[PDB]
Amino acid sequence: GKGRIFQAAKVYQRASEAAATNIVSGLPPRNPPLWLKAIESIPPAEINTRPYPIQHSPPNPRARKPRNLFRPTKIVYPEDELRRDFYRDHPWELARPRMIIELDGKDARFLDWSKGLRQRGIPLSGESVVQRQLWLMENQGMTKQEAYDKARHEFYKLRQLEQMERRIAVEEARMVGGYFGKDLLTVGMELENKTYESWKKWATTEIARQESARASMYTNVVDN
Amino acid sequence: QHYLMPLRDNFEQEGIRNFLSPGSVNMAYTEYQTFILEKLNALVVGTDFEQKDTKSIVLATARDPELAHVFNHASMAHNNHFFFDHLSPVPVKMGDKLFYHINENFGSVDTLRDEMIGTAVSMFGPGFVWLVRTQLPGQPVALRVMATYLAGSPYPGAHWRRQEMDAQTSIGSSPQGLSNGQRFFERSAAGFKGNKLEPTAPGGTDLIPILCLNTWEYAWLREYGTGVGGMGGKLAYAQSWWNMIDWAKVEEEARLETRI
Amino acid sequence: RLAELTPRDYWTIEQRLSVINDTIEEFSTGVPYDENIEIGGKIRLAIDRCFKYDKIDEIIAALKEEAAEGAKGGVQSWAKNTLEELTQRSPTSLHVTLRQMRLGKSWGIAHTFKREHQMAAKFMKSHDFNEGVTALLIDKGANGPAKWKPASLDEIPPGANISEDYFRNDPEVPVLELLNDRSYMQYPYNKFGLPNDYDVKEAIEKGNFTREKLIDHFVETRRGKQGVREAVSDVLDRMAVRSKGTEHVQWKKE
Amino acid sequence: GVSPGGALLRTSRMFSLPPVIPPPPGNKLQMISERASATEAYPTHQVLTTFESSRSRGDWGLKRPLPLKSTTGTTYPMVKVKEMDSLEQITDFTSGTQHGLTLKKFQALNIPISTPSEIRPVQRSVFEADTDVTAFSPDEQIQEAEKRWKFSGPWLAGMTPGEFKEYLAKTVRPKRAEFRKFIQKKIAAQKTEAANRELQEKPESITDDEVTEYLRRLRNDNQVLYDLVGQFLDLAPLKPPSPYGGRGPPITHPSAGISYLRTAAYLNNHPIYGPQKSHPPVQARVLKPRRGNDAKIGVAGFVADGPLGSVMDKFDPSIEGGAKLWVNVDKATVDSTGRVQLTVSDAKATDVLIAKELIGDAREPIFGSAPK
Amino acid sequence: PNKPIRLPPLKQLRVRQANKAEENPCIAVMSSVLACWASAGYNSAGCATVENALRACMDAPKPAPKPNNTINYHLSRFQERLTQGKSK
Amino acid sequence: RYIPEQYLRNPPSDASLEDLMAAQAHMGHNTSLWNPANARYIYGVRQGIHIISLETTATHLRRAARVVEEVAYRGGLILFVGTRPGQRPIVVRAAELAKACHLFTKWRPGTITNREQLLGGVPLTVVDELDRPLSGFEDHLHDRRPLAPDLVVCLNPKENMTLLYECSLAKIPTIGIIDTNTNPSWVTYQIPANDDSLRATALISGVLGRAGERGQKRRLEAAQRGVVTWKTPADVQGYFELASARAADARRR
RNA sequence: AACAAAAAGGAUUAGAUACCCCAGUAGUCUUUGCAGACAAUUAUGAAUGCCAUAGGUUAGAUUUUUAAUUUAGUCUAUAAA
RNA sequence: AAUAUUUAUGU
Ligand SMILES: [Mg+2]
Ligand SMILES: [Mg+2]
Ligand SMILES: [Mg+2]
Ligand SMILES: [Mg+2]
Ligand SMILES: [Mg+2]
Ligand SMILES: [Mg+2]
Ligand SMILES: [Mg+2]
Ligand SMILES: [Mg+2]
Ligand SMILES: [Mg+2]
Ligand SMILES: [Mg+2]
C-alpha cells in the first residue's frame, strides 16, 4: 500500500463532473478544458485484468489442479528442433556474422523455399538450410534425416564456390598488376606482438618483485 | 537489392543504328548486367553493402584481399553502364572548347582516336579504355589515355585495382622488364605497408573518367564476329564506336577550366 | 472494445456510427500485399458494357463479342467463363432476376420486401424451383443436372414476356405486414465502405483536384482507411481522363 | 490459424537466433578455473553485425542500443549476445572478434579438412556421398555403418562409469521387448534364405519359438552378437573387426562449418615466377617452448604442436614480440572433442623469401637483383 | 557449492574504504633495524648497512596520494539492479 | 528500403505490423522483470523475454494517434516528453510537426501542481482562431497563472513517474509507452511497446507527431471558413466580463 | 576425570554479599521412581478452502537430463490487500 | 586479528 493512487483512467469522468456545475450557484458553468470534447468518444481500455494467455503448446492434460494458468507460455516452433541439430554439427557456422536488424520487416514476402536455398533479401545461412529442410520434410514427405542430407549438401556446394572465388580473385588480380593491403593473417600477428610485449613487461616487473621479496624475506640483519 | 536500370535513349528497345543491333545490346547489357547484379546481390545480401551503390563498393572493397571477388562485379557493373551512358543515337558535333583541349594534349582529334583504338587492340584482352582528366595541385587540366584490364577501376581511390598493364608479357629480364618488375614490387610493398607512392588530392579529384570503351569480347564478338581477314571483329567495333561518342556529354563532365 | 463504448443519450445516430467506425479501423492489420482487385480495370469495364441492357438476349450477345478473340476488351478468358455459367442456370430466373434489377432501382426498401413476398410466393408454385432444389441440394448432384422447363433461352421467343407474371400481386397472398413503418429510397448510412464511383465523381465536380492530388484527398479524408489509394486509383483509371494535362481530371462519358 | 502478428514473428530475424549450443565437452573428472575463462574451442553464440550507418547509433536489432564506447572504432563490427535482457535491465553482450576473425584467418589458409587416419599420406575429403550421410534404412549393414559419422547411440569408452549405468537403466533395459521384434524380422529372413534357391532350381515375423533359438546359439561367438546389438542401439563401431573408432565418433560434422573446401590439389600461379611447388607459408607463434614437455605454436589463432624438428628449444626474452617462425600447414582435421587439430610441418626457405617479396620485407629481392 | 546470494535491500551499497591503504614502507625497514640490535648489539658494525637504509627512507620525500577510486559511484548506480532494491 | 534517420525526415502516417516489428517494438523485458498486471498485451515468451503482441501495439497506437489529433484539433496544448540519452531529436521533431512543446530533460517536480512558482517568469501570448497574436491582453498576461499541458505524451513512463502523477492529480490525459515492466495504471491511453529501443520510440513518436500535424491543419482550415473548433478558456473568459465591467464605468461616468 | 550452586580463602573496592582468582561439596553422568512448573516462542493453537510475482535453498520426479518444467518443505524481497 | 584495573550521587 506504499504506492500512490493513480486516477489517470478517470480524468474525463472527474473533469467532466467538475464542469457540470459552477461553484457560485445560480450562474452558468464556465467553459471546460479544451481536451474534454477531444476524448469524449475515446474511453480508455480495460487494464489490470489477467486473461487466459495464448497456449503455444498443448497444456498438460493430466494435471488435476494446475498452476500458472495466467502465465504467458513459451513460443516453440518445429524449426527450433532443427536449428539446434544443424548448428551443433556446424559450430563454426555461428562465427559467420549474421545481421538480425530488420530493414522493413517484409523479408518474408519473397521467400519461396520450393526453389532452393538461395533466396531474395536474406543471406545464405544455417536458417536457409532449416527452412529448406522443413519444406521438403512437409511437402515432399521426406524424413528428418533424408531432407536434412539434401538441403545440407546443397549448402556445401554453395559455400565451396564462395571460398574458391576469394583465392582465384586475388590471384587473378595480381596477374594484371593488382596489389592489395594487409591480410587478416599479418594484421593478427602484429596485434599479438604488441600484447605479448606488454606481458613481457609485466612478467619482468613481477619477476623483479618476487626475487626482491626473497631477499627481504631472508634474514640478513647482521652481516658477519 | 540492386536492380537493372533502363538505358539512356531507349537502346534496349531499338539499339544504336550503326553501332549495335537491338539483340546485341540485349545480350550486352540487359542479359549480362542482370547476371552480374544477380551475383552481386548474393555477395552483399547480408553485409553493409546491401544498400550501397556500385561506386561506393568499388572504393570500399578495393584494397581488401578477402573482398576482391566483390570488387569485380561492382566495378564491372559501373564500367559497363559508364560505357553505355556516353553513346547517342546520332553522332554529335564535338565542342569547340573540347576540340581545342584535345589538340593541346594529343596534337589532333584523330591522333587520339588511333591511340585509344590502338591501345584496345594492343591490349589483347577484356578491359576498358579510359579517357581520364588528370589535374595535379599546380598543373593545368591535362588529359591522357588509360587502359584497364578485366575489371580495373580508373578512380584513384581504387588504385589498388587499377590493373593497367599485364605482368605475364611486361615483366622480364630485359631493361624494360626489370623496370616494370621493380614498379610491381614497389607498389605491392608500399600498398601493404600503407605508404603511398604518389600523393593524391583529397576527394579523389585527380582523375575524372570522361569516356570509356568496353573492349570485353561479349559485347562485339556477336555483332562484328571474330574478324577473320580484317573485316569486322574487334577493330571495326572500336572504329564504329568512335562515331557515336556523345562529345557534348564528354565536354560537360570534363569541366575544363575557362582559358579562352 | 465495443462493449466499453458508452454513448450519451443526446448523441445523434450519426455520431454513434462514427464512433464505431473509427473503432473498427483500429484493428485493421492491412490488406494483403499481392492480392489485387478482382473486378477492376478490364473486367469491371466489361461488366458495364455487357450488363447495361434490359434483356438477357442482349447481355449474352455482348458477352459473345467479348469472348470472341480479337475484341479490344481483353477479357476473353472471363467472358467465355461467364457464358458457361449463364447457360447452366434457370432461364426463367434470369429474365425475372434482371427484371427486378431495373425496377428495384425505383422501389423503396419497405416496398421491396412486400413485392418480394408476392414474387417469391409464385416461385413455390413454379416448376424450376421445385426441380432445381430437389436436383442440386436434396440429391446433391445425383440424377444429373436440373432440367429447367425451358431448356434454353433461345427457346423463349423474343416477344415473349415471362417476367410479367412474377410481378402481379395475387389476392390469395396477403400483403406482408412489416414490424414497423420505417422506409427509405436510399440507404441512410452506407458511406463507411471504400469510396466507389459515386464518391469519386462528386468529388471531382466540387473541386479541381489533379491525378495524384485527388487520391490523397480521399486518403486524408478517410483517415488512412486500408485500400483507399488502390480503390480510388482504380476508379480514375476507368472513369477519368487527362483533360487539361496533369492538373485537371474529368470523366470519360462526356 | 496463426494470427498475422504471429506469422511475422515466426519469420523474424531475431527469432532465427539459434539456441546456445553446449560448450566443447571437456574432461568431467578434472579441475577447472572458477572465474577466469578464455576463448572456447568453437563458438557457442551467434556473431551479430550491423550497417555502419546504424552502428554509430548503437542499433544492433536488439532490445536496446548498445554503448558506443565498447562497440565503435574497430574495423570489423562483431558482437555476441549472451542475454537480450538480463536481471540488470541490460543486454549482456561481448565482442565476437575472438571467433569471428579466427574463421576468416583459417579460411585464408585455403586448406580443406581431412578424415583422421592412424599412422602414404592419402587424404580424403569429408564432403563425399560415400561417407557424409546421416539417413539410413533397415537394409543397412555393418560395412555401411562404418561410413556414417552421426550415430544416435553413445560411445561406450567415452562415457563415464556413472553415465554408463544411467544409459543401461534408461535406454537399454526398456528396449528389451522391441529388440526381440528386431530379431523376428531378421529370423523371417533366416527361414527364407533356405528358399534362396527354392525357386531357381517372407513369413509374418512372429515366432517366440525362434528368437530364443537364435541368441542361445550366439553365446559361443560374442563378436557376431555385438555387431547385431550395435545396429539396434546405433553404436559407433569400436573394435576393428575402421573409421577411426579409437578416439570415438565426432560430436559434430567433420568439417564443423569452418571450411567447406574439398581439396588442396591446386598450384597457386605466381604472377612472375609462375606455378609454385608448395602453398604460401604462414608465420606462426611459439608458445610453451620445449624446455611441461613439448612445444606449441599459434597458427592462425589455433594452437598446434610444433613441427617435427632453436627458438622452440628454449625461451628467449631477447626476441622482440616473441619467437615467430614461418611454416606451412599440411593437413587439418577436427577432433572427436570438437577441436581443430593441425598437423603442422616446418616450411622451406626460398618460399618464405618469395612471400616476403610481395609483402616488401624481403631484404634481398629475388627478381633482377639475384645474379644466381 | 552454492552460488553467491542476492543482497537484500540496503540503504546504500558502498565499500567503507575505496582506496587501498599503503603501509608506510619505512615502518618495515625499522622492524629490520630493531631485529639487528636484538640479535647482535645496539652499538656494533653489522647494523651499519641496515641503519643507513632507515636513514635513506626518512630523507626521501613522501609519494603523492593516489587518485580517488570511483567504485562507490558505480555501485550506487547498479544497486537496485543488482540487489533486491533500496530501503528507507 | 531503410535509413536510420527515416523516422525524423519523413515519419510515417501510420505504423504497420512490419514497421513495428522492424523497429524492435515487440521486445519486452526479461520474463522475471515483468508487471503481471500488464500481461494482457504479452503474446508469448522467447529468448528469455516477453514478446508484446504486434497487433496490440498497432491498435493501441492508432487509438492514441486519434487522441493526439482530436486534442490538437480542439486547440489543446500538447507536451511530448522523452527523457533519455538519445531521445532529444525524436521529441523535438514530433513537437514541431504538432506545434507542441517538448521536454528532453529531467522533469522538475511541481511544474504542474506548483506552476505558480516554477513557471512564474516565463512569457506567454494570446492568439486567435488563425493563431496570430491579439493586442489588448497585456494586463491579463501578468495576473494570469501559468499554463498546463492538455495532453502529455511520455516516451518513458517507467523513468519519470513524478510527471504522470501530477497529471493524474491535475486531471490531464496522458499517453505512454508501457513496457513489459511498466505499470499500465499510470497513463490514460497505453501503447504497449518496447521503450528501450531508440528506433521504436522514433516510430511511435513519429506517428503521433503526424497526428497532431493533421489535426492542426483541420483546425486552421476550419478557422479560415469562420468555424472555430473551440470556445474561449475559462480563465480568459472571466477576464472578458471584467473588461466590459471596467468599461461600464466609462459609459456611466 | 572434568566442570561447578553452596561453604570457605585471596584480591579489587569508600564498603563487595558480588563481577576477577587458588581451590571446592551437592549436582551434571548410569539405573529405577517421584515431580510437571519454562521467553515449553513463530511473543503468532490446530485444520480446511482460496489470492499475483521474483531471487535463493532442501529431498524427489520428468525432460531435447547441457538446462528447463514439476510435487512437497523452508527462507529472503515485493504486488493487490 | 581474541585484547579487558577502578567511574557512585544530583528536593
Ligand atoms: Mg524498458
Ligand atoms: Mg559463598
Ligand atoms: Mg570472596
Ligand atoms: Mg575448578
Ligand atoms: Mg510422570
Ligand atoms: Mg489444540
Ligand atoms: Mg521455494
Ligand atoms: Mg529447516
Ligand atoms: Mg517476508
Ligand atoms: Mg533525580
PDB file of C-alpha atoms in Angstrom, chain C residues 195-210 214-215 217-218 221 232 236 249-251:
ATOM      1  CA  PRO C 195     -15.126   5.134 -51.871  1.00  0.00           C
ATOM      2  CA  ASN C 196     -16.909   3.978 -55.015  1.00  0.00           C
ATOM      3  CA  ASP C 197     -17.554   5.688 -58.352  1.00  0.00           C
ATOM      4  CA  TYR C 198     -20.333   7.781 -56.797  1.00  0.00           C
ATOM      5  CA  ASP C 199     -17.998   9.363 -54.237  1.00  0.00           C
ATOM      6  CA  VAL C 200     -15.162   9.967 -56.708  1.00  0.00           C
ATOM      7  CA  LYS C 201     -17.481  11.615 -59.245  1.00  0.00           C
ATOM      8  CA  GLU C 202     -18.980  14.266 -56.965  1.00  0.00           C
ATOM      9  CA  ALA C 203     -15.539  14.978 -55.500  1.00  0.00           C
ATOM     10  CA  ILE C 204     -14.338  15.893 -58.998  1.00  0.00           C
ATOM     11  CA  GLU C 205     -17.261  18.247 -59.681  1.00  0.00           C
ATOM     12  CA  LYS C 206     -16.967  20.225 -56.433  1.00  0.00           C
ATOM     13  CA  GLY C 207     -13.237  20.801 -56.947  1.00  0.00           C
ATOM     14  CA  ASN C 208     -10.346  20.798 -59.430  1.00  0.00           C
ATOM     15  CA  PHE C 209      -8.164  18.057 -57.973  1.00  0.00           C
ATOM     16  CA  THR C 210      -5.376  16.535 -60.049  1.00  0.00           C
ATOM     17  CA  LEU C 214      -7.211  13.682 -55.816  1.00  0.00           C
ATOM     18  CA  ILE C 215      -6.075  10.315 -54.444  1.00  0.00           C
ATOM     19  CA  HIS C 217      -7.738  13.907 -50.802  1.00  0.00           C
ATOM     20  CA  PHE C 218      -9.621  10.662 -50.173  1.00  0.00           C
ATOM     21  CA  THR C 221     -10.442  12.412 -45.711  1.00  0.00           C
ATOM     22  CA  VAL C 232      -9.684   5.449 -55.829  1.00  0.00           C
ATOM     23  CA  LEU C 236      -9.835   7.080 -62.067  1.00  0.00           C
ATOM     24  CA  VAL C 249      -9.185  15.219 -64.359  1.00  0.00           C
ATOM     25  CA  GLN C 250     -12.686  14.716 -65.776  1.00  0.00           C
ATOM     26  CA  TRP C 251     -14.901  11.736 -66.524  1.00  0.00           C
TER      27      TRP C 251
END
